[PDB]
mmCIF file of C-alpha atoms in Angstrom:
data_model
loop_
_atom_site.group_PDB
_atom_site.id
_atom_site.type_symbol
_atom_site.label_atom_id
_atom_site.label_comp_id
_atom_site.label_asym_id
_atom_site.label_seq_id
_atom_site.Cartn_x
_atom_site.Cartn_y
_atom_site.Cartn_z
ATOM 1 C CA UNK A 6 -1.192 -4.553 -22.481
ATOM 2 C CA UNK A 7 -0.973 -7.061 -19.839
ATOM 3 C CA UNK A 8 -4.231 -7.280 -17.595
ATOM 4 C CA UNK A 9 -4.112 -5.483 -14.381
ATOM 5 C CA UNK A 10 -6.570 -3.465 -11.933
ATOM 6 C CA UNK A 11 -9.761 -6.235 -12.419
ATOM 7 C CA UNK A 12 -10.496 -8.509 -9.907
ATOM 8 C CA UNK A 13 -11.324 -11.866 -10.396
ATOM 9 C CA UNK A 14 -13.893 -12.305 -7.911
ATOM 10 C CA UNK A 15 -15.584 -8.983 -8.256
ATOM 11 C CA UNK A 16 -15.041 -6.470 -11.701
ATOM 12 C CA UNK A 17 -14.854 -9.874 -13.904
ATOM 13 C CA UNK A 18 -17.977 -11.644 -11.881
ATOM 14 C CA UNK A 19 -19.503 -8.410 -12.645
ATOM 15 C CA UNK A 20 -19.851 -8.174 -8.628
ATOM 16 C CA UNK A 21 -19.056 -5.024 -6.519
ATOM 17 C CA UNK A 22 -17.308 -4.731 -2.973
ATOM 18 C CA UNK A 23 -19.165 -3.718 -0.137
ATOM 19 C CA UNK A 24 -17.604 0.101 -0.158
ATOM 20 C CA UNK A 25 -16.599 0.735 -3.561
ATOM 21 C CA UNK A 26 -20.011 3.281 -4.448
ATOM 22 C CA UNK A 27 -18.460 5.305 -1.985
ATOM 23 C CA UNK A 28 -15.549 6.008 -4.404
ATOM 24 C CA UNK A 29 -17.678 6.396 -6.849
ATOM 25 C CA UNK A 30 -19.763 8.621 -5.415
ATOM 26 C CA UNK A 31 -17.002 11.021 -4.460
ATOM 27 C CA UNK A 32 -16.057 11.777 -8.356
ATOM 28 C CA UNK A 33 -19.992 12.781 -8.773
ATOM 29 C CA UNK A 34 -20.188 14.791 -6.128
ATOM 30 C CA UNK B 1 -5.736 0.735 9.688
ATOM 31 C CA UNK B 2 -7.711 3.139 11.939
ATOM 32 C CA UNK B 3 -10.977 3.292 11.589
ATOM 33 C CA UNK B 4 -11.493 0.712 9.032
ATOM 34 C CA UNK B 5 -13.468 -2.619 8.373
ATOM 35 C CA UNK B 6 -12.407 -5.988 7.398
ATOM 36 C CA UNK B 7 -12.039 -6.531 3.396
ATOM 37 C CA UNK B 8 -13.738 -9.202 1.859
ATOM 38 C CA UNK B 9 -12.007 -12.030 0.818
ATOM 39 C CA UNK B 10 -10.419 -10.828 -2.712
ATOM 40 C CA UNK B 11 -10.719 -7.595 -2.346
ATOM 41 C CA UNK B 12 -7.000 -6.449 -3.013
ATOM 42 C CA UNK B 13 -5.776 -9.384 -4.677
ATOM 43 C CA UNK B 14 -2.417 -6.646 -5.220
ATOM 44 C CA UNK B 15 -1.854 -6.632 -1.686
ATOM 45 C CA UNK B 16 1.089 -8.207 -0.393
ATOM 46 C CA UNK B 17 2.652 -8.537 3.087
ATOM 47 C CA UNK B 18 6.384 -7.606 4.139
ATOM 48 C CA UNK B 19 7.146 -10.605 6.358
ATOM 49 C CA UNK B 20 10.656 -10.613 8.414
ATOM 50 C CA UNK B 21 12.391 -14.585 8.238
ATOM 51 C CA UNK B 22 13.952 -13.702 12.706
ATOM 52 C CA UNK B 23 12.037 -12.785 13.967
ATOM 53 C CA UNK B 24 9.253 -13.397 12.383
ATOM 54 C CA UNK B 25 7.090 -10.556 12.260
ATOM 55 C CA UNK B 26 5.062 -7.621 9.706
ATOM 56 C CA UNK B 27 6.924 -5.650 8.348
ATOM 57 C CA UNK B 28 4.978 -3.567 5.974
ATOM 58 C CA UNK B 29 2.608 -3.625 3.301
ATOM 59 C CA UNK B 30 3.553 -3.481 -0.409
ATOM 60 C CA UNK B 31 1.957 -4.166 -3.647
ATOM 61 C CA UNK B 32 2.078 -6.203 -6.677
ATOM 62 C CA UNK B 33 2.220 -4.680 -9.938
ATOM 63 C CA UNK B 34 3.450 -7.900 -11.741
ATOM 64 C CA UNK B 35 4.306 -11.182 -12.318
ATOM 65 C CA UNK B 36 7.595 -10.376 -10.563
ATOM 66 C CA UNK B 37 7.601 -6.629 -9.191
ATOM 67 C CA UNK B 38 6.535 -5.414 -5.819
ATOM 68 C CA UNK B 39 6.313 -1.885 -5.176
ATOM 69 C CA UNK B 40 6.898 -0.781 -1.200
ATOM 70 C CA UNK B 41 7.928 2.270 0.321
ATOM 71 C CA UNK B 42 11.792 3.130 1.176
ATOM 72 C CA UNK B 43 11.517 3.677 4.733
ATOM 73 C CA UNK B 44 10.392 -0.259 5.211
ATOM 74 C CA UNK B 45 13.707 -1.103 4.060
ATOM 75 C CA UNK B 46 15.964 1.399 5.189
ATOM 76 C CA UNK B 47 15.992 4.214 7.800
ATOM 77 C CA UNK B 48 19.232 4.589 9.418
ATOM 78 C CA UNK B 49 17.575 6.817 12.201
ATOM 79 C CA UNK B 50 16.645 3.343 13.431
ATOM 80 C CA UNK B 51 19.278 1.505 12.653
ATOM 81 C CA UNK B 52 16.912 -0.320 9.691
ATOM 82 C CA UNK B 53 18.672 -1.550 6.770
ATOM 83 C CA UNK B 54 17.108 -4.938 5.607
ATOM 84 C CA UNK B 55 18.778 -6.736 2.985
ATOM 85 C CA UNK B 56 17.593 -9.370 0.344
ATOM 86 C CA UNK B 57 17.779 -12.152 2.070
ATOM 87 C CA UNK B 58 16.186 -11.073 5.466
ATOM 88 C CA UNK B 59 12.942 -10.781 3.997
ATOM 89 C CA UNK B 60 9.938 -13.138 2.405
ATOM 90 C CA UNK B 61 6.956 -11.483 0.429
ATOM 91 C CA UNK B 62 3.443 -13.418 1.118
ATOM 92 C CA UNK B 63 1.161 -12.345 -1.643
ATOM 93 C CA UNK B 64 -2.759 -13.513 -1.664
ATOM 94 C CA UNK B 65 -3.510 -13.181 2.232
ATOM 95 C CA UNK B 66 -6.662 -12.382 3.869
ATOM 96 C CA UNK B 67 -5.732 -13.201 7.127
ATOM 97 C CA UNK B 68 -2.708 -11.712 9.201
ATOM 98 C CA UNK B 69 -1.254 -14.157 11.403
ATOM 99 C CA UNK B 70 -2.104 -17.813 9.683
ATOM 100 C CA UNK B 71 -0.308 -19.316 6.887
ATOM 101 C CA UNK B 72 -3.228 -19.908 4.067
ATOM 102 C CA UNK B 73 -1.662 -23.132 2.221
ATOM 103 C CA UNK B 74 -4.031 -23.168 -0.053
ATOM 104 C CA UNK B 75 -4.073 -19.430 -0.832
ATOM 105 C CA UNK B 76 -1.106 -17.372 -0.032
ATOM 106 C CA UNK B 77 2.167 -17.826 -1.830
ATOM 107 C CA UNK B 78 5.739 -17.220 -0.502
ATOM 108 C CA UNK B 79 8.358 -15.483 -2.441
ATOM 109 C CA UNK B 80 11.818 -14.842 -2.074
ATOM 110 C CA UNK B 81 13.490 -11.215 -3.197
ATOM 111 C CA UNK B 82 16.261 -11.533 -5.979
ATOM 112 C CA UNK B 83 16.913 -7.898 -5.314
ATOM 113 C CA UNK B 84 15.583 -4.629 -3.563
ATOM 114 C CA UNK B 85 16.008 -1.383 -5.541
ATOM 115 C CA UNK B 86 15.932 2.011 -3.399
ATOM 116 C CA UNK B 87 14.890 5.346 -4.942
ATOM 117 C CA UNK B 88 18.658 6.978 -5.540
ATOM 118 C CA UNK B 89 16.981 10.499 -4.229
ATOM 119 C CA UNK B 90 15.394 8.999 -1.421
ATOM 120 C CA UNK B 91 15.627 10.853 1.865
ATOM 121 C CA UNK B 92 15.191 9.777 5.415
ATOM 122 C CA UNK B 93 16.928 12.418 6.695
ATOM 123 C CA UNK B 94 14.246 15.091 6.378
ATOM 124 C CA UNK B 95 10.924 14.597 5.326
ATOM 125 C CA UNK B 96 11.371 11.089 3.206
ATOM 126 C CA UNK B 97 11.317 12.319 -0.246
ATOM 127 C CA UNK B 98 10.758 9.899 -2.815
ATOM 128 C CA UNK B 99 9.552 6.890 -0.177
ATOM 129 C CA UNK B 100 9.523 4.859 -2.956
ATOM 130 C CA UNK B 101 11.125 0.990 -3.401
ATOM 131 C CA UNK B 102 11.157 -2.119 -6.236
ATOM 132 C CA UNK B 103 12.316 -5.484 -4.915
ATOM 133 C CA UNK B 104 12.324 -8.344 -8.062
ATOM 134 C CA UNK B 105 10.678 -12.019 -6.950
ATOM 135 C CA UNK B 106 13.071 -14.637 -7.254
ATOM 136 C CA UNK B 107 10.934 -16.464 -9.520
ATOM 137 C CA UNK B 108 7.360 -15.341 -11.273
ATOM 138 C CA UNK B 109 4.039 -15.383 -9.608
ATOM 139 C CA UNK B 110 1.055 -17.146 -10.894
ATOM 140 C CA UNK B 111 -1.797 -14.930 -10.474
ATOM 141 C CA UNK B 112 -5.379 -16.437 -8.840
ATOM 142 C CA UNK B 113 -8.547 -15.483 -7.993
ATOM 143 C CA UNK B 114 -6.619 -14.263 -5.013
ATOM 144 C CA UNK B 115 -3.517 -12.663 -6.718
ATOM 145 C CA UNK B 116 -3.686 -10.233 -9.554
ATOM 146 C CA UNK B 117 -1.887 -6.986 -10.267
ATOM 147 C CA UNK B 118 -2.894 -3.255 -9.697
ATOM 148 C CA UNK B 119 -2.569 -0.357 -12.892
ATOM 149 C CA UNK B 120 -0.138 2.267 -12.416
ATOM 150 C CA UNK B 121 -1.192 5.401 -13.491
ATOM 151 C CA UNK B 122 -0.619 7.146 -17.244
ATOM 152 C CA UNK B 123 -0.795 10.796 -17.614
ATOM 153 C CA UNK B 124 -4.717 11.623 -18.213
ATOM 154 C CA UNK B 125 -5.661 8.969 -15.304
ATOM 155 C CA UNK B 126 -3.344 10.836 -12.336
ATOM 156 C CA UNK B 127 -4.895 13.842 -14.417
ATOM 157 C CA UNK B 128 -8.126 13.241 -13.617
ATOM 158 C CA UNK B 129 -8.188 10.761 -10.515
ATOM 159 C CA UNK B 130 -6.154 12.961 -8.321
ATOM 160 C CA UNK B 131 -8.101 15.529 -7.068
ATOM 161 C CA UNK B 132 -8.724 16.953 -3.758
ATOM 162 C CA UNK B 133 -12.550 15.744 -2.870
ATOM 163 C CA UNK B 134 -12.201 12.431 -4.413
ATOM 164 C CA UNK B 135 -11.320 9.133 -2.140
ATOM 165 C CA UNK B 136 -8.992 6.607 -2.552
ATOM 166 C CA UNK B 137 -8.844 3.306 -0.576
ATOM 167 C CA UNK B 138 -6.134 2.003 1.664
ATOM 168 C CA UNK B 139 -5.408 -1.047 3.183
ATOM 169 C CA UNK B 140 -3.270 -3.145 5.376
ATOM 170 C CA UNK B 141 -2.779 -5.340 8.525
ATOM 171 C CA UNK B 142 -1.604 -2.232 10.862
ATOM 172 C CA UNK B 143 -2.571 -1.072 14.118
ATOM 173 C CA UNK B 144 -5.851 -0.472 14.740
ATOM 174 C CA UNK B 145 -5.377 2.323 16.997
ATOM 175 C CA UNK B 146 -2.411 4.702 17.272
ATOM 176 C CA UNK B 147 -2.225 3.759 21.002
ATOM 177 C CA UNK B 148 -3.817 1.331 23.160
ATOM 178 C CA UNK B 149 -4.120 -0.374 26.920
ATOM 179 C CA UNK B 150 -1.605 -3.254 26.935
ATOM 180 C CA UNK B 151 -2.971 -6.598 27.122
ATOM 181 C CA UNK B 152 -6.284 -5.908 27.223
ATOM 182 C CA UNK B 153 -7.351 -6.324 23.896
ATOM 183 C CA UNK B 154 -5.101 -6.575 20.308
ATOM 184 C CA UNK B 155 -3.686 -3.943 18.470
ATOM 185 C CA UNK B 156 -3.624 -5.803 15.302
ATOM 186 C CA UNK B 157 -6.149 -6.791 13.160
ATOM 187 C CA UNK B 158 -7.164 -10.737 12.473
ATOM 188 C CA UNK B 159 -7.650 -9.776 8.799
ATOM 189 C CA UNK B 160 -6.746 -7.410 6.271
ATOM 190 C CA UNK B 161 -8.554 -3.746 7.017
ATOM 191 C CA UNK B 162 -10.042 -1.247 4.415
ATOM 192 C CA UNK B 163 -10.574 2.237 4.880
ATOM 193 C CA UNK B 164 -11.676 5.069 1.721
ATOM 194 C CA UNK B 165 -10.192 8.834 2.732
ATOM 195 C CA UNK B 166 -10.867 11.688 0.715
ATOM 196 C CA UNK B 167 -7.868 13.879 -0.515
ATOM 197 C CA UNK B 168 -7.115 17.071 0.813
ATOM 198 C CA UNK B 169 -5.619 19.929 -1.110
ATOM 199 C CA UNK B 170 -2.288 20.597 -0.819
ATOM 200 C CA UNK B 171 -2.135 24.139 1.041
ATOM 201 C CA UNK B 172 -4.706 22.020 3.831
ATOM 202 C CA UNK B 173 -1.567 19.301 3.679
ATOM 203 C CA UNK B 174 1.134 21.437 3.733
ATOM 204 C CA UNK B 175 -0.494 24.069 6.961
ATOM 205 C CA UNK B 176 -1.002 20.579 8.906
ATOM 206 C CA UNK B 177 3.025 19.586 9.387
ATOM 207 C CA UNK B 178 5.825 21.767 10.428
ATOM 208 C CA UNK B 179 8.000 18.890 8.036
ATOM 209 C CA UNK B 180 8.721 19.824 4.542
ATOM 210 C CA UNK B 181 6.351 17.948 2.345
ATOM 211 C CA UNK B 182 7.317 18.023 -1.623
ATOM 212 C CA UNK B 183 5.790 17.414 -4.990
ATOM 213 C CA UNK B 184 6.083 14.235 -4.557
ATOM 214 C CA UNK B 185 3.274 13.395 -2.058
ATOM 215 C CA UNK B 186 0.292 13.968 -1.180
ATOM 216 C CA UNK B 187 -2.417 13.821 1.653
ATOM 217 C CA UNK B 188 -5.490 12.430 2.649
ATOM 218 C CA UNK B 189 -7.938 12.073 5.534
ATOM 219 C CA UNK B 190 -11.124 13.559 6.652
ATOM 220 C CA UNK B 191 -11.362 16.914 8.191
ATOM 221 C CA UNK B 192 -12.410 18.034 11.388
ATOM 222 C CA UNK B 193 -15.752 19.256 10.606
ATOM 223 C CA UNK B 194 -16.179 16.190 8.082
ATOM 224 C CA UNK B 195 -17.799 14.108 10.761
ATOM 225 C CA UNK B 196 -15.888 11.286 9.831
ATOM 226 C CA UNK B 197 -12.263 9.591 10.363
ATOM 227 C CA UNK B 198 -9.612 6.449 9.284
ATOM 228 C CA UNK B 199 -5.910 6.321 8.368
ATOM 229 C CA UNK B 200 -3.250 4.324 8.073
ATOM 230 C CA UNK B 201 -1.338 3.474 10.658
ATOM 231 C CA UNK B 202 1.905 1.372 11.746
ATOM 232 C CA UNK B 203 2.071 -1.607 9.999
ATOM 233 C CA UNK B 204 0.355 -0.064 6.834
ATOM 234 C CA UNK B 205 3.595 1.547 5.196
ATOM 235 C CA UNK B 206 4.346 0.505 1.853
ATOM 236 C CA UNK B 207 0.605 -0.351 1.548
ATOM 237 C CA UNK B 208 -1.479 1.040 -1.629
ATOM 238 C CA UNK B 209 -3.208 3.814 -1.617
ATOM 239 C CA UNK B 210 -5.929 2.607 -4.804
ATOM 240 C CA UNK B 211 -8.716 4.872 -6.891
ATOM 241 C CA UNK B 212 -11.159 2.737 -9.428
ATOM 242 C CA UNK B 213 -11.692 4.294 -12.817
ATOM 243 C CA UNK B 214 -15.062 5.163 -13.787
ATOM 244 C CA UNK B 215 -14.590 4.817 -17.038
ATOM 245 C CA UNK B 216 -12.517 1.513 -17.857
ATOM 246 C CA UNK B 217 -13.329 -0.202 -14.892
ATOM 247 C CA UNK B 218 -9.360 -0.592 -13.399
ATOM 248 C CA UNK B 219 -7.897 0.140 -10.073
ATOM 249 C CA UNK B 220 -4.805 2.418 -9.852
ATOM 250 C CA UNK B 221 -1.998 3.007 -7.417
ATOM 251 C CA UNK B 222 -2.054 6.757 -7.382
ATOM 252 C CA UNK B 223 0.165 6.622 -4.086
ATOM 253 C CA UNK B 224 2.058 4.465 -1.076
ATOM 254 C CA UNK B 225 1.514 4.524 2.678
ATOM 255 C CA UNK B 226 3.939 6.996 3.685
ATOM 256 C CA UNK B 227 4.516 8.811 6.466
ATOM 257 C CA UNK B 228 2.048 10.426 9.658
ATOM 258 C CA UNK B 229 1.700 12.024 12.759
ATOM 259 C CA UNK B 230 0.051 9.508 14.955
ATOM 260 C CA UNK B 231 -2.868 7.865 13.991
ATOM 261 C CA UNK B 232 -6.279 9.654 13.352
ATOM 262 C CA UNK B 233 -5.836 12.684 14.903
ATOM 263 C CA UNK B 234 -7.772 15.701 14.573
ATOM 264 C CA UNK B 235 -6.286 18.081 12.149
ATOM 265 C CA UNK B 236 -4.046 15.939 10.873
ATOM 266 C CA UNK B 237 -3.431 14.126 7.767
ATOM 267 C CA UNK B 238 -1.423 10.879 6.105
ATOM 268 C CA UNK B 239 1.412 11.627 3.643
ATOM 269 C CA UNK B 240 1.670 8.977 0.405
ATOM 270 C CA UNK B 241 4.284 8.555 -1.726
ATOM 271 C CA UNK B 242 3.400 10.070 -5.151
ATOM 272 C CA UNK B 243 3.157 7.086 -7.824
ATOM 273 C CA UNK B 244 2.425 8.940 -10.594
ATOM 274 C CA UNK B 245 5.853 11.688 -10.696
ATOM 275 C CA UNK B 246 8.136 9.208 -9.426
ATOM 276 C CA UNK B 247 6.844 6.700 -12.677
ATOM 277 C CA UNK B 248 10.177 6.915 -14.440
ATOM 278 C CA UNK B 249 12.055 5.618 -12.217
ATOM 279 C CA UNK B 250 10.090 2.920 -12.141
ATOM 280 C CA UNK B 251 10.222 2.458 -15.805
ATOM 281 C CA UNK B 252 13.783 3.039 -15.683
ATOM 282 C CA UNK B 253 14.405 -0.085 -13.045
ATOM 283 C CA UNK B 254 12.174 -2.597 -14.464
ATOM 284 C CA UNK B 255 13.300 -1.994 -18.163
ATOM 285 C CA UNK B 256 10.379 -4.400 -19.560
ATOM 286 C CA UNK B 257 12.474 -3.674 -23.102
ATOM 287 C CA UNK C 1 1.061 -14.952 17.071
ATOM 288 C CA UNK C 2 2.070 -16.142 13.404
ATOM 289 C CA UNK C 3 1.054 -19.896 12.594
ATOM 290 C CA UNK C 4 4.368 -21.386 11.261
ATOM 291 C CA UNK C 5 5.431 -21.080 7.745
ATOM 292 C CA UNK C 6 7.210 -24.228 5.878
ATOM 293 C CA UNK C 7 11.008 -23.786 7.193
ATOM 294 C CA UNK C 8 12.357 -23.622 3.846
ATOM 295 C CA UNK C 9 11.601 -20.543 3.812
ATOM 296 C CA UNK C 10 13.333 -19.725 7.141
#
């Protein structure tokens, strides 16, 4: 229920952090 | 952090910073996972082996920093613990089993741009998130280097670090420690041959270990800065306390009903 | 380090 795990400044500015594609990557691998 | 880089500003807006009233200093990391719970790791607040037993009132949570050492008046905001709740099971005797803590804020925190809560895992997300191969993030305001020439330089970072290690599977954990390492951890770290490196490091206990969902978008707190032998070594990896199994205790101390 | 925190706190 209550909001948690998006970050204002990046996930709800639809903006990404400088290192996050790595994580990403890592599930396609 | 070892290895890391600094975060940018909002980056872990769950982070939050064990800070000591006399002296002042870190203590460890920790992280917010509401309005009024922080989640560390035992061994911040007690380990008799060192004569560490902090209570309540020795101790100030600073939620929303970037940087280590200044006071951000505009940012950061300064909480007081009502009271600190130690995993009943928890053992510092031999290989800190269930390193896991809750401490209640005094009074609610209004979330910001720079303060927000992290997901704990359900069932399907550990499920599927924790597996060896995939990384996770850490973070924290810890050494920067397991050892280091005195007074030339800084140990410490001037803002928060970030590092992503992969995790390793357990029989690769469990061949790298002579200590007895349980269910309820887990390691991570690059291997020898992975031509890479980073981990935690003192300071960084308590700290979250995070992994983003693909699928809904949401950061988890699969684990917690645990425990380590030195900082970066080769063939060696860091121990986090695991999140996801030690859950209902969780559920059972915050009783949201 | 530590830039000074409001001594309410401390």
């Amino acid at each position: 229920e209550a909001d948690c795990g998006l970050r204002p400044l990046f996930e709800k500015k639809s903006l990404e952090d400088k290192t996050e594609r790595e994580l990403l990557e890592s599930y396609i691998d | 952090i070892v290895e890391g880089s600094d975060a940018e500003i909002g980056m872990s807006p769950w982070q939050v910073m064990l800070f000591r009233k006399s002296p002042q200093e870190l203590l460890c990391g920790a992280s917010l996972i509401s309005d009024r719970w922080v989640l560390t790791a035992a061994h911040c607040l007690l380990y008799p082996p060192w004569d560490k037993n902090f209570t309540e009132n020795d101790l100030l949570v600073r939620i929303g920093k970037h940087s280590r050492t200044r006071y951000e008046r505009n940012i950061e905001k300064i909480s007081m613990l009502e009271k600190i709740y130690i995993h009943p099971r928890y053992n510092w005797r031999e290989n800190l089993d269930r390193d896991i803590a809750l401490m209640k804020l005094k009074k609610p925190v209004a979330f910001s741009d720079y303060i927000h809560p992290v997901c704990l895992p359900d069932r399907e997300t550990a499920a599927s998130l924790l597996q060896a191969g995939y990384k996770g993030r850490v973070t924290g305001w810890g050494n920067l280097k397991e050892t280091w020439t005195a007074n030339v330089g800084k140990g410490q970072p001037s803002v928060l670090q970030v590092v992503n290690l992969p995790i390793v599977e357990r029989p690769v954990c469990k061949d790298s420690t002579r200590i007895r390492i349980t269910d309820n951890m887990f390691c991570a770290g690059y291997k020898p041959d992975e031509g890479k490196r980073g981990d935690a490091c003192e300071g960084d206990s308590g700290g979250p270990f995070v992994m983003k969902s693909p699928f809904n978008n949401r950061w988890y707190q699969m684990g917690i800065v645990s425990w380590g032998e030195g900082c970066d070594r080769d063939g060696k990896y860091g121990f986090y306390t695991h999140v996801f199994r030690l859950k209902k205790w969780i559920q059972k101390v915050i009783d949201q009903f | 380090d530590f830039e000074e925190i409001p001594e309410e706190y401390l």
